[PDB]
């Protein structure tokens, strides 16, 4: 220690400098953390966590391909009617027809004209029905080729309905209203009102009773400053609603910004109406994810009319940074990465719920909700005002449709909901008193009782003349405020629409609602208790159906063989005896190994999007989640599936509930798993750096041969000396020697299409010796060939030789890159002197897989033609096999293609920029499942995957003679 | 994607396809990804399944079809599965590096059975039924063991 | 708050709103909590709320009108919640 | 320097330990300050003060 | 290149992957000299790839998908392939010779 | 490529802290990412570069040479150049031999 200190003093070295800097930075951490804990104790955990920024420009999703979704919807409806899903023209079919009309154009008209003229009405009544309905829809769409898209709601209005069972069971249903069955009748009832709302050629406004308040009306501010029902404004609003119900209301050239429009809300229905009407809607979501984006894509594919664009963006209305960023993004030019849009309407319906938060409980969550619902709304309108003023816009105001509550503290226990809703009413006066009237127009919609706890009593509230609305009805009322006449009225002066349904006229609404809920709840418990006690009395007095569960029955899915007359009707009559079946090639079998297991499981995931019982059980078996057991198990004898690890019995019913999440998480396109690629972590990619040694490294003991090799390499830059004690050698590198130090590269392709985790060749029955000998690609090919022969029904491959010579069965499949694992072995593991099998080179060949197939399963001496076509090697294989069979050197051929995913191939594809950058995808908010999006605006690279695909083709004559299934004709 | 849509559209134009009859495009790599050679084989398996089931899977990742693809009036880009009442033929198209363009056409197997006699078809159906039963027992035995 | 219109609502306006609405509500909630913890039902505190007759008439005052108008929810909250016995609301609309 | 390093190795002394701790605490200061600047840009200078 | 030089961080072209494919040579032939849009079928047969190519080209011409075909085979000598052939003992030992 | 002197590398475990060597910022970050706590990277305020100091227990690759016994191969005649046949230098750089 003293010698070290002397040397440090001589060197002017401060050994304590690092510690002093550390203590200073620790004090800085302490004081900054003290500031953070003060701010956390002040605003609260909820507020601080909830002000986290969520919006980003790169994460916005645009939907504008209504031209495509129109054809998609038309085909869906066409096939549904043909198959008999839709026997009658119900309101859902009418709504879909309206959407098709809204997206109609000349190309669409030609599409439907072809599909209906080509329809053969003689194929039963369903084809005649679809032909007639298609003719009607063609006639309707031809009329509205040039007409603007219109929001027209045709759903049957539904009222509340609560029933109490004999056993005290509460069931709520949205049964159709008997009196009202159209939107026009809804508006007529709205104008008519009821007894409660009364006080002491011809439009619907004419039908209003005298001295009565319609359920939906507009209020005018009296000179005293109070808002009262106004006949003129109410009549204007109801006339607009009547026109929107009968003709439909267009929202062309209308740019809307709607927040809080998630599924199951009023904003979602308003968004659907805007998309129907043709508006450019920016919908903001606080739950941005694949589920929400898929929901909004479905909404747009269903309702997005011609000229409409849906911009789904992540957004936190509780953070002013998100508010400013969203408004900037909307108003900024497309060249600057914005939208270049100017908002015509704003619908800030975003709110977070509050239950059981009274005055004493107002806390961080309540303050944050108040921010979202009042303060950040005001900031958002201020931001829109600032953008419009900066761009010098005075004559294009944005209509802020404010969500207002008729009740301000009537129910209580809702935190600051009433405070936010009531403070939103200052905007009516602020519009006049401040200098933003020309940029914004205030439309306070007082939303009434809407039905999405609060539903069981809706029927009881309606028995006194009060009107309760559904989400669709409330959205219709809100969209009635976006009509041109109401927009012009808002521009004249701010408007207060009361859509409360007469809920204000009931005295003591909170207490009456509580009484209704108490009555229903008391009746339900009394009935349930009485039923339980009667049941127990019956059981004790009189003393003391087997349910059958589905079990997995996996089918090979051989082609359906129809009767001969049926199969002959479709084909031409002159085909009989015309074709040389020896010259006709038929795919008799097929199979694959891929990210979704076998061909069956992949097909189920492709077509239906989820696994059935058979598919899920097959996936669990493939992934090793469930193993089969037959014999004694925990004493009792069990025969069936068991968990592979715990060995506990698992029923096919429980297989889904126990392994669906695991299968989905470890199947398909997903983050690269190093355990499946030999500890390959793309986030930590090993490289080595050449450096020149600057000092003689310390000796390290090495073998005699190893020391000799080091000396041969480094020449005079290393020194090897024998140790007489044990005969080993010490190797001493000198200055100037060459050294390789590992270094790690952060690589940006993290997601790949990987065969499901737990996929093992032993599961299919390949021996461990074969697994050690051959590459994983070869194992995939062997499994694919076996499964393809199983699909062809050829359980024994030698069964082919009963019909063809050994020279007449070929294998024309191949690979684009072959045994990349063996190539990596020979090029890197051998370079590093790791243990590598001496035959890794013959395992690396592209034809090695076909060789192993032939010399493990087939034994054929027929033609062998291994192609390379990169991504087209499988069509190459099909072409080569077809030509082999037609030339006749083969009669059966194994065609297809295979390739593997590995570190080096992935990295070189990334260098090429052919694959998609996963970091950019994460920046855009894309999940691994949605990385691969062919034929989309945002596609920026292919999604690399691995596996094999094999088909057994043969002559048609031979396929008929062996009696193998025929899946198709090449 | 642009080149392939253009190629299919040009094929459909030159071969005189009826206007208003777009070919329904199936994109399978949205789900299975892109293998460097198993691709066309997976698409053939999917095409055979489409033929036999009459079901056309939709590109569920097709969030928004590219506007540039609207010009190809003979191509449709579904996003959800379609329960079609029968698929006659399927055109599998692949494009590998090195200018490896490739096309295949898979016709429905039922058009083959119209080229044979009633007795031949009946004996073929009987043989296929027996072979399907044998294959089922073999497959389930091999799966469990 | 002077010369703070809708476009100018900012940190100062949010802080003033906190002082004048949110922390007032928190203060009444705290008094309610103390009285309830001590089991006091028959000695309510009279909250004399300062209220503005004008809510946005003049404008350019940030969130003053918002705070004053949202203070009017307390009349209904008194009936609808369980703090009536601990507090009594007296909204004094102060004039010029 | 070489003699000092030899003595430090003999003493099992980590001369870089203080610097490593300092860099860790500097990163901690950076991330806490990032949180504070986010909260300041969010609530505002007036509100936070 | 892609397996060792990239591992060592030596300068390697970003398109060494397409330059490594067996069908890259045929691609470059077509797109430097031929410009044909005719059938491309690159075989792999180890030492028999040339007879494979002749047979595939023959069958292409007989099927009529082509009338002229460029058949043949090619391969290169390199360190790692030589070393692996030595490992399998397929090549002759020069020291024994 | 000399078959009499075939380059290999050997993994050894570092026994003493190697001396620092100047390295770029990105290179030092890569070294730290690889070795975790077995390397120490420190910025040099004089020039902004980084010094990388491997510690005891770190992983190291030292080149070694293997005497390989396949010294003779059938090689295209020395001096064979594609430029002699007229292939451009850009093509030569792009494509493989
Ligand atoms: C891929 C193949 C392409 C073509 C393949 C089409 C197949 C399939 C055709 C359309 C499938 C419904 C066939 C058309 C039927 C309309 O064209 S309806 C669209 C326009 N109609 C409307 O807007 C009417 C709505 N207004 C009303 O009042 C209706 O009558 C309501 C809503 C149903 C209720 O009123 P009520 O019936 O008087 O009671």
UniProtKB/Swiss-Prot annotation, chain C:
It comes from the Eukaryota. 4'-phosphopantetheine is transferred from CoA to a specific serine of the Acyl carrier domain by the C-terminal PPT domain. This modification is essential for activity because fatty acids are bound in thioester linkage to the sulfhydryl of the prosthetic group. [Alpha(6)beta(6)] hexamers of two multifunctional subunits (alpha and beta). Fatty acid synthetase catalyzes the formation of long-chain fatty acids from acetyl-CoA, malonyl-CoA and NADPH. The alpha subunit contains domains for: acyl carrier protein, 3-oxoacyl-[acyl-carrier-protein] reductase, and 3-oxoacyl-[acyl-carrier-protein] synthase. This subunit coordinates the binding of the six beta subunits to the enzyme complex. Belongs to the thiolase-like superfamily. Fungal fatty acid synthetase subunit alpha family. Present with 17000 molecules/cell in log phase SD medium. This is Fatty acid synthase subunit alpha. The chain holds residues 776 to 871 of 1887 of the full protein.
From Swiss-Prot, chain D:
Present with 17000 molecules/cell in log phase SD medium. Belongs to the thiolase-like superfamily. Fungal fatty acid synthetase subunit alpha family. Fatty acid synthetase catalyzes the formation of long-chain fatty acids from acetyl-CoA, malonyl-CoA and NADPH. The alpha subunit contains domains for: acyl carrier protein, 3-oxoacyl-[acyl-carrier-protein] reductase, and 3-oxoacyl-[acyl-carrier-protein] synthase. This subunit coordinates the binding of the six beta subunits to the enzyme complex. [Alpha(6)beta(6)] hexamers of two multifunctional subunits (alpha and beta). This is Fatty acid synthase subunit alpha. 4'-phosphopantetheine is transferred from CoA to a specific serine of the Acyl carrier domain by the C-terminal PPT domain. This modification is essential for activity because fatty acids are bound in thioester linkage to the sulfhydryl of the prosthetic group.
Curated annotation (Swiss-Prot), chain E:
The chain holds residues 1259 to 1355 of 1887 of the full protein. [Alpha(6)beta(6)] hexamers of two multifunctional subunits (alpha and beta). Fatty acid synthetase catalyzes the formation of long-chain fatty acids from acetyl-CoA, malonyl-CoA and NADPH. The alpha subunit contains domains for: acyl carrier protein, 3-oxoacyl-[acyl-carrier-protein] reductase, and 3-oxoacyl-[acyl-carrier-protein] synthase. This subunit coordinates the binding of the six beta subunits to the enzyme complex. It comes from Saccharomyces cerevisiae (strain ATCC 204508 / S288c). It comes from the Eukaryota. Present with 17000 molecules/cell in log phase SD medium. Belongs to the thiolase-like superfamily. Fungal fatty acid synthetase subunit alpha family. This is Fatty acid synthase subunit alpha. 4'-phosphopantetheine is transferred from CoA to a specific serine of the Acyl carrier domain by the C-terminal PPT domain. This modification is essential for activity because fatty acids are bound in thioester linkage to the sulfhydryl of the prosthetic group. The active site is at 47 (for beta-ketoacyl synthase activity).
